[PDB]
Coordinates of C-alpha atoms and ligand atoms in Angstrom, one line a residue:
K4 CA 71.5 2.1 -75.4
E5 CA 69.1 -0.8 -74.6
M6 CA 68.2 -0.5 -70.9
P7 CA 68.5 -3.9 -69.2
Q8 CA 65.2 -5.6 -68.2
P9 CA 64.4 -8.7 -66.2
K10 CA 62.6 -11.8 -67.4
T11 CA 59.2 -11.4 -69.0
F12 CA 56.0 -13.4 -68.9
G13 CA 54.5 -12.8 -72.4
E14 CA 51.6 -10.3 -72.3
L15 CA 52.1 -9.8 -68.5
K16 CA 55.6 -8.4 -69.2
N17 CA 57.4 -8.2 -65.8
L18 CA 54.4 -7.9 -63.5
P19 CA 54.5 -11.5 -62.1
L20 CA 58.0 -10.7 -60.6
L21 CA 56.2 -8.7 -57.9
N22 CA 53.8 -11.5 -57.2
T23 CA 55.8 -12.4 -54.1
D24 CA 55.7 -11.6 -50.4
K25 CA 59.2 -10.1 -50.6
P26 CA 59.1 -7.7 -53.6
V27 CA 61.8 -5.2 -52.5
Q28 CA 64.3 -8.1 -51.8
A29 CA 63.4 -9.5 -55.2
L30 CA 64.1 -6.2 -56.9
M31 CA 67.4 -6.0 -55.1
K32 CA 68.4 -9.4 -56.5
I33 CA 67.4 -8.2 -60.0
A34 CA 69.5 -5.1 -59.5
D35 CA 72.5 -7.3 -58.5
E36 CA 72.1 -9.1 -61.8
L37 CA 71.3 -6.1 -64.1
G38 CA 73.2 -3.2 -62.5
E39 CA 72.5 0.5 -61.9
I40 CA 69.3 0.8 -64.0
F41 CA 66.6 -1.5 -65.3
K42 CA 63.3 -1.1 -66.9
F43 CA 60.2 -2.8 -65.4
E44 CA 57.1 -3.1 -67.5
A45 CA 53.6 -4.2 -66.9
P46 CA 50.5 -4.0 -69.0
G47 CA 49.8 -0.2 -69.4
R48 CA 52.8 1.0 -67.4
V49 CA 56.6 1.3 -67.2
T50 CA 59.1 2.4 -64.6
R51 CA 62.9 2.4 -64.2
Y52 CA 64.7 1.2 -61.1
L53 CA 67.9 3.1 -60.1
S54 CA 70.6 1.7 -57.8
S55 CA 73.7 3.7 -58.3
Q56 CA 74.8 7.0 -56.7
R57 CA 75.9 8.1 -60.2
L58 CA 72.3 8.0 -61.5
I59 CA 70.5 8.8 -58.3
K60 CA 72.4 12.1 -57.8
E61 CA 70.7 13.2 -61.1
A62 CA 67.3 11.9 -60.0
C63 CA 67.6 13.9 -56.8
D64 CA 67.9 17.2 -58.8
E65 CA 64.7 18.9 -57.9
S66 CA 64.8 21.2 -61.0
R67 CA 64.6 18.0 -63.1
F68 CA 62.5 15.6 -61.0
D69 CA 59.7 15.8 -58.5
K70 CA 58.2 13.3 -56.1
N71 CA 55.8 10.9 -57.8
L72 CA 53.1 8.9 -56.0
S73 CA 53.8 5.3 -56.6
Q74 CA 50.8 3.0 -57.1
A75 CA 51.4 2.0 -53.5
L76 CA 51.1 5.6 -52.3
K77 CA 48.0 6.2 -54.5
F78 CA 46.3 3.3 -52.6
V79 CA 47.5 4.6 -49.2
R80 CA 46.0 8.0 -50.3
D81 CA 42.5 6.4 -50.0
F82 CA 43.0 6.7 -46.2
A83 CA 45.9 9.1 -45.8
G84 CA 44.4 11.6 -48.3
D85 CA 46.3 14.8 -48.9
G86 CA 48.4 14.5 -45.8
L87 CA 52.1 15.3 -46.4
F88 CA 53.2 11.8 -47.4
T89 CA 50.6 11.1 -50.0
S90 CA 50.2 14.6 -51.5
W91 CA 51.6 16.0 -54.7
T92 CA 54.1 18.9 -54.4
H93 CA 51.8 21.1 -56.4
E94 CA 48.8 20.6 -54.1
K95 CA 48.0 23.7 -52.0
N96 CA 47.7 21.5 -49.0
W97 CA 51.2 20.1 -49.3
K98 CA 53.0 23.4 -49.2
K99 CA 50.6 24.8 -46.5
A100 CA 51.1 21.7 -44.2
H101 CA 54.9 21.7 -45.0
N102 CA 55.3 25.3 -44.0
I103 CA 53.1 25.0 -40.9
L104 CA 54.6 21.7 -39.6
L105 CA 58.3 21.9 -40.4
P106 CA 59.4 24.1 -37.4
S107 CA 57.7 21.7 -35.0
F108 CA 59.9 18.9 -36.3
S109 CA 63.3 20.5 -35.9
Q110 CA 66.1 18.9 -33.9
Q111 CA 65.5 21.9 -31.6
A112 CA 61.7 21.1 -31.4
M113 CA 62.7 17.7 -29.9
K114 CA 63.5 19.5 -26.6
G115 CA 59.8 19.8 -26.0
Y116 CA 59.0 16.2 -27.0
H117 CA 61.9 14.7 -24.9
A118 CA 60.0 14.2 -21.6
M119 CA 57.1 12.3 -23.3
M120 CA 59.6 10.1 -25.3
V121 CA 61.3 9.3 -21.9
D122 CA 57.8 8.4 -20.5
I123 CA 57.4 5.6 -23.2
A124 CA 61.1 4.5 -23.1
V125 CA 60.8 4.0 -19.3
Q126 CA 57.7 1.8 -19.9
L127 CA 59.8 -0.4 -22.3
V128 CA 62.8 -0.6 -19.8
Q129 CA 60.4 -1.5 -17.0
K130 CA 58.7 -4.2 -19.1
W131 CA 62.0 -5.8 -19.7
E132 CA 63.2 -5.4 -16.1
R133 CA 60.1 -7.3 -15.1
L134 CA 60.6 -10.4 -17.2
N135 CA 61.4 -13.6 -15.4
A136 CA 64.6 -15.5 -15.9
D137 CA 63.6 -18.0 -18.6
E138 CA 61.7 -15.4 -20.6
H139 CA 62.5 -13.6 -23.9
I140 CA 61.7 -10.5 -25.8
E141 CA 59.8 -10.3 -29.1
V142 CA 61.8 -7.4 -30.6
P143 CA 59.8 -5.9 -33.4
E144 CA 56.6 -6.4 -31.4
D145 CA 58.0 -4.4 -28.4
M146 CA 59.6 -1.8 -30.7
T147 CA 56.3 -1.2 -32.4
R148 CA 54.6 -0.8 -29.0
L149 CA 57.2 1.9 -28.2
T150 CA 57.1 3.8 -31.5
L151 CA 53.4 3.9 -31.8
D152 CA 52.9 5.1 -28.3
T153 CA 55.6 7.7 -28.7
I154 CA 54.1 9.4 -31.7
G155 CA 50.6 9.1 -30.2
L156 CA 51.7 10.8 -27.0
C157 CA 54.2 13.4 -28.2
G158 CA 52.1 14.2 -31.2
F159 CA 48.5 14.2 -30.0
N160 CA 48.6 13.7 -26.2
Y161 CA 46.9 10.4 -26.8
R162 CA 47.9 7.1 -25.0
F163 CA 47.6 3.9 -27.1
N164 CA 48.8 2.1 -23.9
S165 CA 50.4 -0.6 -26.1
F166 CA 52.5 -2.0 -23.2
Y167 CA 49.2 -2.9 -21.4
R168 CA 48.0 -5.1 -24.3
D169 CA 48.5 -8.2 -26.3
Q170 CA 45.7 -7.0 -28.7
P171 CA 47.2 -3.9 -30.4
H172 CA 44.2 -1.3 -30.3
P173 CA 41.1 -1.0 -32.6
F174 CA 42.4 2.0 -34.5
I175 CA 45.7 0.2 -35.2
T176 CA 44.0 -3.1 -36.1
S177 CA 42.1 -1.1 -38.8
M178 CA 45.2 0.9 -39.9
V179 CA 47.3 -2.4 -40.2
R180 CA 44.4 -4.0 -42.2
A181 CA 44.1 -0.9 -44.5
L182 CA 47.8 -0.9 -45.2
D183 CA 47.6 -4.6 -46.0
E184 CA 44.7 -4.1 -48.5
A185 CA 46.7 -1.3 -50.3
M186 CA 49.7 -3.6 -50.6
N187 CA 47.7 -6.5 -52.0
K188 CA 45.9 -4.3 -54.6
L189 CA 49.3 -3.9 -56.3
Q190 CA 49.5 -7.5 -57.5
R191 CA 45.9 -7.8 -58.5
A192 CA 44.2 -7.8 -62.0
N193 CA 40.7 -6.4 -62.6
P194 CA 40.0 -4.4 -59.4
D195 CA 36.2 -4.2 -60.0
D196 CA 35.8 -8.0 -60.1
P197 CA 33.0 -9.1 -57.7
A198 CA 35.5 -11.4 -55.8
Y199 CA 37.0 -8.3 -54.1
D200 CA 33.6 -6.9 -53.0
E201 CA 34.4 -8.2 -49.4
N202 CA 37.9 -6.6 -49.5
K203 CA 36.3 -3.3 -50.5
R204 CA 33.7 -3.6 -47.7
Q205 CA 36.4 -4.1 -45.0
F206 CA 38.5 -1.4 -46.4
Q207 CA 35.7 1.2 -46.2
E208 CA 35.0 0.2 -42.6
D209 CA 38.6 0.5 -41.5
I210 CA 38.8 4.0 -43.0
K211 CA 35.6 4.9 -40.9
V212 CA 37.3 3.7 -37.7
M213 CA 40.4 5.7 -38.3
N214 CA 38.5 8.8 -39.2
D215 CA 36.1 8.5 -36.2
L216 CA 38.8 8.3 -33.6
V217 CA 40.9 11.0 -35.0
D218 CA 38.2 13.6 -35.8
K219 CA 37.0 13.0 -32.2
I220 CA 40.5 13.7 -30.8
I221 CA 40.5 16.9 -33.0
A222 CA 37.1 18.1 -31.9
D223 CA 37.7 17.2 -28.1
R224 CA 40.9 19.3 -28.2
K225 CA 39.1 22.2 -30.1
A226 CA 36.2 22.1 -27.6
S227 CA 38.4 21.6 -24.5
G228 CA 40.6 24.6 -25.4
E229 CA 43.3 23.0 -23.2
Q230 CA 46.7 23.7 -24.6
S231 CA 49.6 21.5 -24.9
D232 CA 52.1 22.8 -27.5
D233 CA 52.2 19.4 -29.3
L234 CA 51.8 18.6 -32.9
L235 CA 48.0 18.8 -32.8
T236 CA 48.1 22.2 -31.1
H237 CA 50.5 23.5 -33.7
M238 CA 48.1 22.4 -36.4
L239 CA 44.9 23.9 -34.8
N240 CA 46.5 27.3 -34.3
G241 CA 49.3 27.6 -36.8
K242 CA 49.1 29.6 -40.0
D243 CA 51.1 29.2 -43.2
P244 CA 53.4 32.2 -43.6
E245 CA 52.9 32.2 -47.4
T246 CA 49.1 32.0 -47.8
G247 CA 48.3 33.1 -44.3
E248 CA 45.9 30.2 -44.0
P249 CA 45.6 27.5 -41.4
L250 CA 44.9 23.8 -42.2
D251 CA 41.3 22.8 -42.3
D252 CA 40.1 20.0 -39.9
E253 CA 39.9 17.3 -42.6
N254 CA 43.5 17.8 -43.6
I255 CA 44.5 17.8 -40.0
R256 CA 42.8 14.4 -39.7
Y257 CA 44.8 13.2 -42.7
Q258 CA 48.0 14.5 -41.1
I259 CA 47.4 12.7 -37.9
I260 CA 46.6 9.4 -39.8
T261 CA 49.9 10.0 -41.7
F262 CA 51.9 10.6 -38.6
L263 CA 50.5 7.6 -36.9
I264 CA 51.5 5.4 -39.9
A265 CA 54.6 7.4 -40.9
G266 CA 55.5 8.4 -37.4
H267 CA 56.0 4.9 -35.9
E268 CA 56.4 2.1 -38.4
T269 CA 59.8 2.7 -40.0
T270 CA 61.1 3.8 -36.6
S271 CA 60.2 0.4 -35.1
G272 CA 61.9 -1.3 -38.0
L273 CA 65.1 0.8 -37.4
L274 CA 65.3 -0.1 -33.8
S275 CA 64.7 -3.8 -34.5
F276 CA 67.4 -3.9 -37.2
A277 CA 69.8 -1.9 -35.0
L278 CA 69.4 -4.4 -32.1
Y279 CA 69.7 -7.3 -34.7
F280 CA 73.1 -5.9 -35.9
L281 CA 74.3 -5.2 -32.3
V282 CA 73.7 -8.8 -31.1
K283 CA 75.4 -10.1 -34.3
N284 CA 78.4 -7.9 -33.7
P285 CA 79.4 -8.2 -30.1
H286 CA 82.4 -5.8 -30.4
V287 CA 80.1 -3.1 -31.7
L288 CA 77.6 -3.8 -29.0
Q289 CA 80.3 -3.5 -26.4
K290 CA 81.5 0.0 -27.8
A291 CA 78.0 1.3 -27.8
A292 CA 77.3 -0.1 -24.3
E293 CA 80.5 1.7 -23.1
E294 CA 79.2 5.0 -24.5
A295 CA 75.8 4.6 -23.0
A296 CA 77.2 3.9 -19.6
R297 CA 79.7 6.8 -19.8
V298 CA 77.1 9.4 -21.1
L299 CA 73.8 8.4 -19.4
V300 CA 74.9 9.2 -15.8
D301 CA 71.5 10.1 -14.5
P302 CA 68.3 8.0 -13.9
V303 CA 66.5 9.9 -16.5
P304 CA 68.4 10.8 -19.7
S305 CA 68.4 14.5 -20.6
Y306 CA 68.0 15.9 -24.1
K307 CA 71.6 17.0 -24.2
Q308 CA 72.8 13.5 -23.1
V309 CA 71.0 11.9 -26.0
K310 CA 72.8 14.3 -28.4
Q311 CA 76.1 13.1 -26.9
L312 CA 75.5 9.5 -27.9
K313 CA 77.6 9.8 -31.0
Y314 CA 78.4 6.1 -31.4
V315 CA 74.8 5.0 -30.8
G316 CA 73.9 7.5 -33.7
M317 CA 76.6 5.8 -35.9
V318 CA 75.0 2.4 -35.1
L319 CA 71.6 3.7 -36.2
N320 CA 72.9 5.2 -39.4
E321 CA 74.7 1.9 -40.3
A322 CA 71.4 0.0 -39.7
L323 CA 69.7 2.5 -42.0
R324 CA 72.4 2.0 -44.6
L325 CA 71.9 -1.8 -44.7
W326 CA 68.1 -1.9 -44.2
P327 CA 66.4 1.4 -44.8
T328 CA 62.9 0.6 -43.5
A329 CA 61.1 2.8 -46.1
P330 CA 63.1 1.2 -48.9
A331 CA 62.0 3.1 -52.0
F332 CA 60.7 6.3 -53.4
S333 CA 59.3 7.4 -56.7
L334 CA 60.1 10.4 -59.0
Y335 CA 58.9 11.8 -62.3
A336 CA 60.6 13.9 -64.9
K337 CA 59.5 17.5 -64.9
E338 CA 60.7 18.0 -68.4
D339 CA 62.4 15.9 -71.2
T340 CA 65.9 15.1 -69.9
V341 CA 68.8 12.7 -70.3
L342 CA 69.8 10.5 -67.5
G343 CA 73.5 9.6 -67.1
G344 CA 74.5 10.8 -70.6
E345 CA 72.8 7.6 -71.9
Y346 CA 69.1 7.3 -71.1
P347 CA 66.6 9.8 -72.7
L348 CA 63.5 10.4 -70.7
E349 CA 60.3 12.3 -71.6
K350 CA 58.4 14.7 -69.3
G351 CA 56.3 12.5 -67.0
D352 CA 58.5 9.4 -67.2
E353 CA 58.9 7.7 -63.8
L354 CA 61.9 6.5 -61.7
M355 CA 62.0 4.3 -58.6
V356 CA 65.0 4.8 -56.3
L357 CA 65.9 1.4 -54.7
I358 CA 67.4 2.7 -51.5
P359 CA 69.0 -0.6 -50.1
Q360 CA 70.8 -1.0 -53.5
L361 CA 72.0 2.6 -53.4
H362 CA 73.4 1.9 -50.0
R363 CA 75.4 -1.0 -51.4
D364 CA 77.1 0.9 -54.3
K365 CA 80.7 -0.2 -54.0
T366 CA 82.0 2.9 -55.8
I367 CA 80.9 4.9 -52.8
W368 CA 81.2 2.5 -49.8
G369 CA 84.0 0.2 -50.8
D370 CA 84.0 -3.6 -51.4
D371 CA 82.8 -4.6 -47.9
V372 CA 79.1 -3.3 -48.3
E373 CA 77.5 -6.2 -46.4
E374 CA 79.5 -5.7 -43.3
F375 CA 78.0 -3.8 -40.4
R376 CA 80.6 -1.1 -39.6
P377 CA 79.3 2.0 -37.7
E378 CA 82.7 3.6 -38.1
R379 CA 81.7 4.5 -41.7
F380 CA 79.7 7.3 -40.1
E381 CA 82.6 8.6 -37.9
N382 CA 82.1 11.9 -39.8
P383 CA 78.7 11.8 -41.5
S384 CA 79.8 14.8 -43.7
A385 CA 82.3 12.5 -45.5
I386 CA 79.5 10.7 -47.3
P387 CA 79.0 12.1 -50.8
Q388 CA 75.8 13.9 -51.7
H389 CA 72.9 11.6 -52.5
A390 CA 74.8 8.5 -51.5
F391 CA 72.8 7.9 -48.3
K392 CA 69.1 8.6 -48.5
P393 CA 67.1 6.6 -45.9
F394 CA 64.8 9.7 -45.4
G395 CA 64.2 10.5 -49.1
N396 CA 65.2 13.7 -50.9
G397 CA 65.0 17.5 -50.9
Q398 CA 61.8 19.3 -50.0
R399 CA 60.0 16.0 -50.0
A400 CA 62.4 14.4 -47.5
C401 CA 61.0 12.8 -44.3
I402 CA 59.7 15.6 -42.0
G403 CA 60.0 13.1 -39.0
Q404 CA 63.8 12.4 -39.4
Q405 CA 65.0 14.2 -36.3
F406 CA 62.0 12.9 -34.3
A407 CA 62.7 9.3 -35.3
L408 CA 66.5 9.6 -34.7
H409 CA 66.1 11.3 -31.3
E410 CA 63.6 8.6 -30.1
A411 CA 65.8 5.8 -31.5
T412 CA 68.9 7.2 -29.9
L413 CA 67.3 7.7 -26.5
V414 CA 65.7 4.2 -26.5
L415 CA 68.7 2.3 -27.7
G416 CA 71.0 4.3 -25.2
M417 CA 68.7 3.3 -22.4
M418 CA 68.5 -0.4 -23.5
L419 CA 72.3 -0.6 -23.7
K420 CA 72.7 1.1 -20.3
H421 CA 70.2 -1.1 -18.5
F422 CA 70.7 -4.7 -20.1
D423 CA 73.0 -7.2 -21.5
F424 CA 71.6 -8.9 -24.6
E425 CA 71.8 -12.6 -25.8
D426 CA 71.0 -13.9 -29.3
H427 CA 69.8 -17.1 -27.6
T428 CA 68.3 -18.7 -30.8
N429 CA 71.1 -17.7 -33.1
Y430 CA 68.4 -15.9 -35.1
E431 CA 68.4 -16.2 -38.9
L432 CA 67.4 -12.9 -40.4
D433 CA 64.0 -13.1 -42.1
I434 CA 62.8 -9.7 -43.4
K435 CA 59.0 -9.3 -43.7
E436 CA 57.7 -6.8 -46.2
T437 CA 54.6 -4.6 -45.6
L438 CA 55.7 -2.0 -47.9
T439 CA 58.1 -1.3 -44.9
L440 CA 60.7 -3.8 -43.7
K441 CA 61.2 -5.6 -40.3
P442 CA 63.1 -8.7 -39.0
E443 CA 60.2 -11.2 -38.5
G444 CA 60.6 -13.5 -35.5
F445 CA 63.6 -11.7 -34.1
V446 CA 63.9 -12.5 -30.4
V447 CA 66.5 -11.9 -27.7
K448 CA 67.1 -12.3 -23.9
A449 CA 67.9 -9.3 -21.8
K450 CA 69.7 -9.7 -18.5
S451 CA 69.4 -6.7 -16.3
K452 CA 72.4 -4.8 -15.1
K453 CA 70.2 -3.7 -12.1
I454 CA 70.7 0.0 -12.5
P455 CA 67.8 1.9 -11.0
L456 CA 65.5 4.2 -12.9
Ligands
LIG501 C1 63.4 5.5 -39.4 C2 62.3 6.2 -39.5 C3 61.8 6.8 -40.7 C4 62.2 6.6 -42.0 C5 63.3 5.6 -42.5 C6 61.4 7.4 -42.9 C7 61.6 7.5 -44.2 C8 60.9 8.4 -45.0 C9 61.0 8.5 -46.4 C10 62.0 7.7 -47.3 C11 60.2 9.5 -46.9 C12 60.1 10.0 -48.3 C13 58.9 9.3 -49.0 C14 58.8 9.6 -50.5 O1 59.7 10.3 -51.2 O2 57.9 9.0 -51.2 C15 59.6 10.1 -45.7 C16 58.6 11.0 -45.8 C17 57.9 11.4 -44.7 N1 58.0 11.0 -43.4 FE1 59.3 9.6 -42.8 N2 60.6 8.2 -42.1 C18 60.7 7.8 -40.8 C19 60.1 8.3 -39.7 C20 59.0 9.2 -39.7 C21 58.4 9.7 -38.6 C22 58.7 9.3 -37.1 C23 57.4 10.6 -39.1 C24 56.5 11.5 -38.3 C25 56.6 11.6 -37.0 C26 57.5 10.6 -40.5 C27 56.8 11.4 -41.3 C28 57.0 11.5 -42.7 C29 56.2 12.4 -43.5 C30 55.0 13.3 -43.1 C31 56.7 12.3 -44.8 C32 56.3 13.2 -46.0 C33 57.1 14.5 -46.0 C34 56.6 15.3 -47.2 O3 56.7 14.8 -48.4 O4 56.2 16.5 -47.1 N3 58.6 9.8 -40.8 N4 60.0 9.4 -44.6
LIG502 O1 53.9 1.0 -56.2 C1 54.5 1.2 -57.3 O2 54.2 2.0 -58.2 C2 55.8 0.5 -57.5 C3 56.1 0.2 -58.9 C4 55.0 -0.7 -59.5 C5 54.0 -1.3 -59.0 N1 53.3 -1.9 -60.0 C6 54.0 -1.7 -61.1 C7 53.8 -2.2 -62.4 C8 54.7 -1.8 -63.4 C9 55.8 -1.0 -63.1 C10 55.9 -0.6 -61.8 C11 55.1 -1.0 -60.8 N2 55.9 -0.7 -56.6 C12 57.0 -1.3 -56.2 O3 58.1 -0.9 -56.5 C13 56.8 -2.3 -55.1 F1 57.4 -3.6 -55.5 F2 55.5 -2.5 -54.9 C14 57.5 -1.9 -53.8 F3 58.9 -1.8 -54.0 F4 57.2 -2.9 -52.7 C15 57.0 -0.5 -53.3 F5 55.7 -0.5 -53.4 F6 57.5 0.5 -54.2 C16 57.4 -0.2 -51.9 F7 58.8 -0.3 -51.8 F8 56.9 -1.0 -51.0 C17 57.0 1.3 -51.5 F9 55.7 1.3 -51.5 F10 57.4 2.2 -52.5 C18 57.6 1.7 -50.1 F11 58.6 2.0 -50.3 F12 57.5 0.8 -49.4 C19 56.7 2.9 -49.5 F13 55.5 2.4 -49.1 F14 56.5 3.8 -50.4 C20 57.5 3.4 -48.3 F15 57.7 2.4 -47.4 F16 56.8 4.4 -47.7 F17 58.7 4.0 -48.7

């Protein structure tokens, strides 16, 4: 069976198709044209993009496929190193860090982070309470202030103080610029060409900034001896039950860098898409606002109250369905195997899972896949296995899933309790790609309900 393949460019094969500032959205369009699987070739490499639950349920069989580092992740590894996100499953430091960190990310571990999440959420609510009448909110900008600050504080007892700034912090300026370089390197022939000497110079300097700050945080905390019980504490003290070993300080640095990138970016995207969909669907916004008012009966939300925001959780899942903010992941075949009864693969062959396309599979979701309908998630158990994968798969799934969802549920609950929202520009969705996805230029107005904190 000849696997479908999109248009080619002579000796460059399919590579120029990714020479665009919206590559995921381009791949989605190709998937619409070509169906559940297509081959994608560039000089010296091939992968296959999967979009159906029928095929993806096979790819998610951990006995048959393991996480691969995409080229994107290999480039991110230059600064995220052998942190959890950019490590191979077979690296000693993956299993050690996994075993050590997993407990501290449980739905139950969120009880300890809740107060610090509220600290940052209240800063956001106060910002918006303090806007004057004519003024508006830059949504992804403020969500990114929130989610960065939340992972910084809950995770490392460090305050980025993003709500005190227009200029986003020297660590973050570097981190953003590092991510940008990694992204550009993808659509770039002859890496060692003298032209990119300046790009390499900046890259190295940004790594230095990120490492300096973080190693200092580490060493201050070690020296100080003062004990929170936060993520960094867990790491400095905790031992892997299997090997009996702790993480070394360098790996700890890589984990912190990873959490700061991983631990905020996709979360700000989620919140921004959720608020986008709410203002475009006023009946949904009203139902969610009713729940927030009924449940959040105290000035400060409790942990248990956040767990009771069932409909707000449905809204977030439906936002993740339509626009999963980490929109792909990569696998390789552990052994020769046949995909879908039709497509033979050799050991080592790669697959890409195109999550937004999976989440539009009409055999799973019905014909109305573009509609925003939180009620799809009335009972999340009703969704078939491997149909909904915004947090990846298996032992390599997102370690931060419960953290992200607790934070997003708390913040969105507070926003809906405290304000009415207006889509005053009738905003036209424009999704910016930086590996991750966000609605660029999304702005709203928020009129206070005048409920005291
Ligand atoms: C809406 C928010 C988020 C989404 C959509 C998301 C999505 C994902 C996805 C798809 C993966 C799998 C990557 C792959 O297979 O290549 C992943 C892994 C990971 N995520 Fe997230 N994530 C989010 C939030 C967070 C947060 C808040 C943290 C940390 C606080 C975090 C930390 C990580 C880490 C460490 C991994 C690697 C886990 C491992 O392989 O051992 N994520 N995430
Ligand atoms: O990075 C890669 O290896 C693959 C495939 C690829 C890149 N170059 C190729 C040449 C020939 C064949 C395949 C490729 N790149 C892509 O699919 C892509 F277009 F860059 C992509 F979709 F934007 C992406 F890089 F995969 C991606 F989606 F941004 C991503 F990086 F995987 C990602 F998803 F965003 C992410 F960064 F991993 C995540 F956000 F963390 F999930």
